[PDB]
Design a protein around this nucleic acid. Sequence first.
RNA 1: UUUAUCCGGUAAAGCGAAUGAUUAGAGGUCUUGGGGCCGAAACGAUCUCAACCUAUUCUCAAACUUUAAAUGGGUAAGAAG
RNA 2: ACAGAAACCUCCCGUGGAGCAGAAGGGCAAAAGCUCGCUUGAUCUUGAUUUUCAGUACGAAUACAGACCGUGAAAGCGGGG
RNA 3: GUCUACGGCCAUACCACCCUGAACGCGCCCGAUCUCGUCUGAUCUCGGAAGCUAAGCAGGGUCGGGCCUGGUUAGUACUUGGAUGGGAGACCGCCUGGGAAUACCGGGUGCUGUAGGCUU
RNA 4: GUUUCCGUAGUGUAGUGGUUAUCACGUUCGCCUAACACGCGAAAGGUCCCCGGUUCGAAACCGGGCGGAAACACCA
Lengths: 75, 213, 292, 170, 159
Amino acid sequence: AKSKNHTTHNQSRKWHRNGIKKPRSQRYESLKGVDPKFLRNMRFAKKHNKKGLKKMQANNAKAMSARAEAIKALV
Amino acid sequence: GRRPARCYRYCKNKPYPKSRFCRGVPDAKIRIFDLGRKKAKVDEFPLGGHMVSDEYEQLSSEALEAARICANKYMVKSCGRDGFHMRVRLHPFHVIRINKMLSCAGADRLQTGMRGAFGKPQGTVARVHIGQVIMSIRTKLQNEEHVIEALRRAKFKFPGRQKIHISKKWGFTKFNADEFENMVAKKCLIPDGCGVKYVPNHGPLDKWRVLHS
Amino acid sequence: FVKVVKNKAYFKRYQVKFRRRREGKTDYYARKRLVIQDKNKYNTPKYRMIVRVTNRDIICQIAYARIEGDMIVCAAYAHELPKYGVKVGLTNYAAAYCTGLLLARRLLNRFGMDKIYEGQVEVTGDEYNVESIDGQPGAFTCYLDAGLARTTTGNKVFGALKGAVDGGLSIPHSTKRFPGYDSESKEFNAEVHRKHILGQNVADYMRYLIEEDEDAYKKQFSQYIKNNVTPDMMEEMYKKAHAAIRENPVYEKKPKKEVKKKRWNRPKMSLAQKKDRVAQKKASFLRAQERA
Amino acid sequence: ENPMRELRIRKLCLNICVGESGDRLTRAAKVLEQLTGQTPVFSKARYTVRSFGIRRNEKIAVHCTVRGAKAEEILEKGLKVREYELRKNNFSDTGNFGFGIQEHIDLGIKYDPSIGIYGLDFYVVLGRPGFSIADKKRRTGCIGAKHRISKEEAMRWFQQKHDGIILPGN
Amino acid sequence: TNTKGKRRGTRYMFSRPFRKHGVVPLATYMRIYKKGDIVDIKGMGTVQKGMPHKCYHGKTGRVYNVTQHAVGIVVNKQVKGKILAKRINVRIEHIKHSKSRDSFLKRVKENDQKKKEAKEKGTWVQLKRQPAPPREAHFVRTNGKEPELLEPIPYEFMA
RNA sequence: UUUAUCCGGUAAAGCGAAUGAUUAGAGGUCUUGGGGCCGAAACGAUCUCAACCUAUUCUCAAACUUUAAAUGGGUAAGAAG
RNA sequence: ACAGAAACCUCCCGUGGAGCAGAAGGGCAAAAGCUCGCUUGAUCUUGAUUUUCAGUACGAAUACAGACCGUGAAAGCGGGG
RNA sequence: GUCUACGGCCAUACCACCCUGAACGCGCCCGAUCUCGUCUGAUCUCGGAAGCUAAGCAGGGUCGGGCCUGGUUAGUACUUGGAUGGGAGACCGCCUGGGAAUACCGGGUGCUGUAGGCUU
RNA sequence: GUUUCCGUAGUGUAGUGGUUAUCACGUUCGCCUAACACGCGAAAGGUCCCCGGUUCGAAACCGGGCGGAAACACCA
Ligand SMILES: [Mg+2]
Ligand SMILES: [Mg+2]
Ligand SMILES: [Mg+2]
Ligand SMILES: [Mg+2]
Ligand SMILES: [Mg+2]
Ligand SMILES: [Mg+2]
Ligand SMILES: [Mg+2]
Ligand SMILES: [Mg+2]
Ligand SMILES: [Mg+2]
């Protein structure tokens, strides 16, 4: 009652017919896997961002009016 | 005794050297891969007659024996006992196998047929490639014919097919015969029993100081 | 005869050690563990204070390690110390202090910190361990490098350390080896470090030797006689140094330009000049014995 | 005129082998103690041997190393017994030498009927200034080509200070 | 059927090459890795802690973590069809900066530079690479020789 | 399919590079031997054979490898830059 | 010295021929070889991953993180071998 | 030129032997009052500075071993595809591409990183 | 061929866990005996089959072998 004990025969044919998809990689992949002491921290970075938006907005408008003046001084 | 050479004529398998891995190898039939005046010199003995295989095959140890002996017999006659060297250049050495004869008694009842198919050591054989030398001989330049035919008889202990060829080298060196007398007289080459040392413009100068001295 | 150990085979297979090994200068495993900076840092360095007491001069220097070759930020030697009123006995544990102290302050003049984390001043010989001030530049730090000195109690290396700690670097040092630790009890005297820092080792040797015999004095330390140095005095050279060092640590160099620039090595012989010497011989030989 | 190639004694080694352990060894230690004035180190068996009555990690010999002037003062008062004469094949290939004695009493020593007579091996390592280059830890190295004490320099060492004959014939 | 053990068939991979048996040169763990950087795995005998394993000896992946002495690294591994982008935690010793990217970067730095310049001209410069064209009509010249005559040479049997 | 770039230990080769086998001679009281033969005996003479090793040479290895292909496997060749 | 192919000592050579509880295989030197001091990182605790893969378990491993600690002048190193 | 301190890559650096060291260091050296370590201040620690380059090291030398390149062997061995090629068979021939290794010949013999000397 | 079992003094046979080896018999020497037996006192005798490995060490523990033995070789 003996038989075959493997083969990897047509096969190439199969796990290949539908393709072999090189894994569709998004931007913005998961941070799960990373050392907790990164995340522990970068969440205090991410959480206390808005504290410091007043600077951010004014300091934007400074650069925006300085570059409205740079492009207008070119004109 | 053994199956006829036929069945182990051809190299199918990877070399089985007698080692740790196989053991209980019966000692190789052949034992002397040179005879005659192996006490010769390079300078008195100038004819590297050769026997060369033309086929990718295996040669049994027991063929090599016969092949040798029948060349010791014709040379002797021919040259005399002192008047040659013969060298065999295939010491049998990958080991050949035998399933253990499918032994059974009378009508029998069980052999198990194929289980543990792997055999045992039977003997020993040489690998031989094409254009590769099996036997070589040296004599006097005089005595070419008497090499030719000695290897000629040896071909007939010996399967497949194989040419007899006469070399361009001093006897048993690698140095092309048109060239010794010169290369010795100036000492690129220095006598060393059978062979010869090639001495180059390399080592310390006090090595040279000994020659041309 | 024997078998020749040193075959061709010996040298085909002989695999060299690893240069600063052959010369016999460097734990590197241990340089490994000292130097290489963790990779939750990527660029930021790892400073080590390097002290090797030579034999005549103690060298101390802070170094950080780059892939091209560890860069030295600051270096303070012992043979500078004549400047600071210390003429002699300058490979001596008490001068390793001044040197290490120097180093700490020549460093701390840069990154403008000579006005903060001064460390201990009067000098005790205790736990001084710098505590970084909040709202300021946080203190400097480095992981002492002994090199190859069997660091027993008393040895100058981790003694120069005491200097750089006293001088305001934040090295992790324990006290288990400062001259003063009692290896059958496990404390300090600390007032042994008093002495050991200011050289009343050498004073009290300069006093056991003198009253016994003359001319072992003078032999054992001539330059301690010459330069009109004495015991009693000693303690109050060094105290001028850990003061004088600390009012001015900075190096001024000495400017350098003159040299004529002669070549008084010997040069490599060119090919042809070896090429003949064999042809120059062998014509010296041949000629010589085509005769006799 | 040589600067400081003062061929001079680095050390004197005293070994007293006695394949026994316990007493007959412990007493031998007092001989070296007495002779030298320093507590000798007990050696032990490299490994067991059957015809001998010794066993791996069993104590066998007791040995010392004596150095500085007190080496000179036991080499002298050593050979004396060998009346300032040795043989050709003790001046060794590395410029050391070796002379054995038969009985410890002959060196100005008192016999107790208990503490018998175990001679000893005297050997001496001739050196020279800058032979510690090898043995040190930092910047180790090897000792030149010359600066190595040859057999024949170690010979006419021993022949111009202890002025011995050094008789030939094995 | 064979043994699954993690280090089968590695007898002669992980084996350090020649005359390098010993102290791991320190440089190889004092160059900085950081997430995004592409890295080639290359297993090593000496250090066994934080080894990769043979089924990715000699692959490349980008780095996604950086721990104290290791680098979490995403690599693609083929497995009866479906390739799996998958993440391992390999100690620095077994890792290098692949110069794979580093033809591009030097090609970018050149193209942005050659585009910003020749904009003040407005002349169109050949930015793209282009495969090796067919070799152009050139001439040759012999001067004062005819060319040398080859003949195939007669066989004689050497041995 | 190119161009970069890694990865790779198979064919071949070598074995005067490691390990393992193995032929032969020159050479060597290396050592040492065990037999001779000439020697009471004597590295004395001369042989001889063991073993070793100094230059050599024959021939090999799947559970060897200094070298070392062809065929092969990763990446990368940008707007997520 | 007794001491002999082997005890004991001392010099020199000694890329690795040892050694590293074991099959081999890979690894190893002012180490991972050997000797001693100090000890419990063989401890308590979440998670992530590798390997066997279906990419399920178990086993075994890898990286991190949190406690509490040994060691070490210290950097680190250490959650059995 | 050169050295020291720390170094990178780890022999073009090793090894073997031969030659020369001006200054500073680097070394050899001299001793055990302390620290500390030993059977022994033989190594480590320390306090020194009476000598000399004796060696290391450094600098050089060898038709020197080795290592590192080049060539040669060699378009050889081997090989991707290829054929209703040969050959009783082993194997061999060609077409389309790729293409090694030894013996044998050559050349080379460590480059530099920071800090600090000396030759002012 | 496959599965077991042994081998130790001149012989038959004990023995241990890894330090050590026995019994009986045989035999050599005395004594007793007129002389042999028997009896009584003394004695010497193997690489523990040949090996390689482990181990402080092996007769004894692995692996290989060599010699002597035993036991199966069933449906047709
Ligand atoms: Mg250490
Ligand atoms: Mg393979
Ligand atoms: Mg250690
Ligand atoms: Mg933890
Ligand atoms: Mg001393
Ligand atoms: Mg010198
Ligand atoms: Mg000199
Ligand atoms: Mg050379
Ligand atoms: Mg077809």
